[PDB]
Swiss-Prot record:
It catalyses: benzoyl-CoA + NADPH + O2 + H(+) = 2,3-epoxy-2,3-dihydrobenzoyl-CoA + NADP(+) + H2O. One of its GO terms (cellular component) is cytosol. The keyword Transcription regulation does not apply. Keywords: Aromatic hydrocarbons catabolism, Dioxygenase, Iron, Metal-binding, NADP, Oxidoreductase. It is an enzyme of class 1 (oxidoreductase). It comes from the Bacteria. This is Benzoyl-CoA oxygenase component B. It comes from Aromatoleum evansii (Azoarcus evansii). The lineage of its organism: Bacteria, Pseudomonadati, Pseudomonadota, Betaproteobacteria, Rhodocyclales.
Length: 477
């Protein structure tokens, strides 16, 4: 019923409500310019959140995405919640940011916010080559949710950061993925997402960085941010499912053709129009290593500071069996010293980036293990693996050297001769591009990917998840 749906009593804060209503047309102009291409008249079968009530939170129906009901939804407030780590452990959580942390928390929220529209901008062309209505609908669902995450951060900026907050909300729509004068902040969000295989890896791997960053902020002493991220985690889960099941369905299809043709010869697989498993492995290597750089330098005074001040906790902070202060704790990280990769212990507070990275690696591996059930049930030997964490890194201690996927420091000549086996080549990408082509007949799936296990919201897999309204009704006519 509400114009800006929310469970935050927005209408009782009239100054804030005015400011968000003032900002909304510019969000909608951004959505129209940079959102899913040519989609202004589509009716999409979308889920929309209307609460955080884990039973009846999200309801489905057709909507044109310009009319999507983007809302602000915080996890329920908890009475007498305490801060759980850092200097301030045991004190009451903050409803407003302490002045001394204000600009730091602001930059953290803006940086998180910036990735949300960035992903929409990267993915805006994908619809033209959607391999199915089911997949097109999933893409759009991810898009409108990422749009909501921008709302979720812009709300915090306006509600808790005054004028600076408003100015950040405006600049969040002035930056643009890949733009020369005003690029998005983070490299991985500034690059192209050129085809559906990249899109599925991105939502499987890079949205998972979102998951771990958000789980760290879900711990924050700044409780409105903590409550915001806590609810976004439940949405991020859907994104991770799109990416994991997306790739799982490509692997499934490729294995079907391997069994049918009785061969694992790449040339024969490609003649049949599937993506050979070794090439899938390269895309995994590419997105995994690129995403890894997002956690930042292994050793960081800044990250020590976020923890100590109560701004950002460790993943699942409350399950960790230590003092949650870490003045006298250690953490084991790698190091490179000439022609050797070694391990060393450093003060735990200085290595929080690396700890979060390690948590993400573990989570990604759990998903790859699930992928591996597929070749295994076909009786194939192929297994997907993650490359050594030092492989293909632009950030941190491995940035000045080459590491092979199996964890050796290698020479410039070996990198130059071998990396074509490890990362997608121009020729691999051209091949994958040649498979990309829309498939919009109900219940039909492009030949490079298998059908999903089930539909959406109990609908058949052949349901018309998107109705294009190809006819162009005339103004006032
Ligand atoms: Fe997001
Ligand atoms: Fe996401
Ligand atoms: O997300």
């Amino acid at each position: 019923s509400e114009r800006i749906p929310n469970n935050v009593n927005l209408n009782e804060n009239k100054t804030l409500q005015r400011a968000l209503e003032q900002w909304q047309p510019s969000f909608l102009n951004w959505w129209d310019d940079m959102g899913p291409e040519n989609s202004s008249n589509y009716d999409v079968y979308l889920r929309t959140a209307v609460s955080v009530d884990p039973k009846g939170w999200a309801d489905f129906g057709y909507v044109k995405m310009h009319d999507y009901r983007w809302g602000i939804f915080l996890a329920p407030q908890e009475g007498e919640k305490k801060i759980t780590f850092g200097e301030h452990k045991g004190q009451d959580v903050w409803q407003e940011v302490p002045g001394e942390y204000r600009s730091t928390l602001r930059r953290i929220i803006v940086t998180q916010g910036d990735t949300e529209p960035a992903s929409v901008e990267q993915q805006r062309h994908l619809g033209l080559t959607a391999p199915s209505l089911y997949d097109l609908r999933n893409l759009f669902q991810v898009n409108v949710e990422e749009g909501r995450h921008l709302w979720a951060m812009v709300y915090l900026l306006h509600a808790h950061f005054g004028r600076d907050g408003r100015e950040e909300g405006e600049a969040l729509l002035e930056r643009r993925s890949g733009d020369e004068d005003n690029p998005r902040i983070l490299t991985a969000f500034n690059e192209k997402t050129p085809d559906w295989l990249s899109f599925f890896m991105f939502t499987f791997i890079t949205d998972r960085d979102g998951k771990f960053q958000l789980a760290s902020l879900a711990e924050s002493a700044f409780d409105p941010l903590a409550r915001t991220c806590k609810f976004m985690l439940t949405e991020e889960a859907h994104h991770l499912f799109v990416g994991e099941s997306g790739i799982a369905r490509v692997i499934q299809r490729t294995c079907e053709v391997m069994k049918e043709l009785g061969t694992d010869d790449p040339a024969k697989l490609r003649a049949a129009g599937v993506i050979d498993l070794p090439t899938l492995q390269k895309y995994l290597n590419f997105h995994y290593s690129v995403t890894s750089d997002l956690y930042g330098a292994e050793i960081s005074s800044n990250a020590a500071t976020y923890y100590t001040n109560g701004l950002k906790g460790r993943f699942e902070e409350e399950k960790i069996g230590d003092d949650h202060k870490l003045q006298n704790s250690e953490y084991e990280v790698m190091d490179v010293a000439g022609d050797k990769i070694l391990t060393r212990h450093v003060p735990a507070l200085s290595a929080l980036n690396e700890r979060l990275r390690d948590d993400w690696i573990t989570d990604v591996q759990a998903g790859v293990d699930r992928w591996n059930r597929i070749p295994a049930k076909f009786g194939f030997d192929f297994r997907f693996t993650l490359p050594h964490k030092g492989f293909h890194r632009k950030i941190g201690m491995f940035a000045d050297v080459h590491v092979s996927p199996d964890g050796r420091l290698i020479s410039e000549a070996e990198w130059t001769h071998q990396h074509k086996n490890w990362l997608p080549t121009e020729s691999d990408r051209l091949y994958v591009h040649s498979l990309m082509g829309r498939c919009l007949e109900p219940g039909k799936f492009a030949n490079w990917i298998a059908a999903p296990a089930r539909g959406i919201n109990n609908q058949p897999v052949n349901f018309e998840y998107v109705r294009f309204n190809w006819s162009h009704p005339q103004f006032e006519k």
